[PDB]
């Protein structure tokens, strides 16, 4: 219960850092996966939604994941951007904001049930 | 047990993300703290070492934390370096390696007991 919560929080944090270092070191996404295809995204869609069925914050996390998928795919269609500092920073700001909100809502979901 | 393992991992990852963004955005450490003074570093010194007393991996974690204090001060005495890409990348790798190694050892400690 509480074990599963911390595990998922560490999971999404691990995914974010992996992508951040890919961007900072290599100026590219490369083998990175969108959140929906990452460890956390698969847990949330396949297991998380059903365990948290009928709780409002679930729809909010799904939206955040979905919104980032779009941002992620757009950049995937343009790694010319990640060499550019401004476009690099923009993306880096977007991932941090997405993960931050999700963790807080995820905390809320686990406490609620 | 497994819960505590994941919680501390989430804690050090949180610190790592914060300092990375401080570096990326402001090109200086500024209000950043070395790991030893963040939540995890304080937890390890006050609670972690004693709970895992006499186990070799503890001395290794203390070593990594102590070493980063020195790395932190050297970089702090030369924030001109964080403007230089190579020296910035050098520091970011020092951070990733310090955190990665500590996490691996922290896992080792928790599985053993």
Distance from CA of B45 to the nearest CA of A (A): 21
Q: What are phi and psi of A34, to 5 degrees?
A: -65, 160
Backbone angles phi, psi at B55, to 5 degrees: -105, 135
Structure tokens at A104: 């807080």
As a whole number of angstroms, the distance between CA A61 and CA A49 comes to 10
Residue B104 Cα, gap to closest chain A Cα (Å): 13
Chain B residues whose beta carbon lies within 8 Å of the beta carbon of residue A9:
6, 10
Record the resolution, in angstroms: 1.9
Cα–Cα distance measured from residue A90 to residue A21, given in angstroms and rounded to the nearest whole number = 15
Residues of B in Cβ contact (< 8 Å) with A96: 17, 21
* Cα atoms in the Cβ-side hemisphere of radius 13 Å centred on A24: 25
- Cβ atoms of A71 and A91 closer than 8 Å: yes
Q: Where are the domains of chain A?
A: 1-113
d(CA A108, CA A90): 28
Q: Does A33 touch chain B (CB under 8 A)?
A: no
Q: Write down the H helix ranges in B27-84.
A: 39-43, 49-51, 56-76
Q: Is B48 in a helix, a strand, or coil?
A: helix
Question: CB A17 to CB B13 under 8 A?
Answer: yes
* Maximum distance among all Cα pairs of chain A, rounded to whole angstroms: 45
Closest CA to A47 of A108, A97, A106: A106
């Amino acid at each position: 219960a509480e074990e599963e919560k911390e595990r998922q929080i560490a999971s999404i944090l691990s995914w974010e850092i992996d992508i951040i270092y890919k961007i900072l070191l290599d100026s590219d996404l490369g083998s990175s996966l969108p959140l929906s295809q990452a460890d956390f995204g698969l847990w949330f869609n396949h297991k998380g939604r059903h365990y948290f069925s009928g709780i409002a914050e679930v729809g909010h996390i799904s939206r955040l994941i979905q919104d980032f998928d779009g941002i992620f795919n757009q950049t995937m269609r343009n790694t010319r951007n990640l060499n550019n500092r401004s476009l690099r920073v923009k993306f880096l700001l977007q991932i941090r904001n997405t993960v931050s909100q999700i963790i807080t809502l995820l905390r809320e979901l686990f406490e609620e049930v």
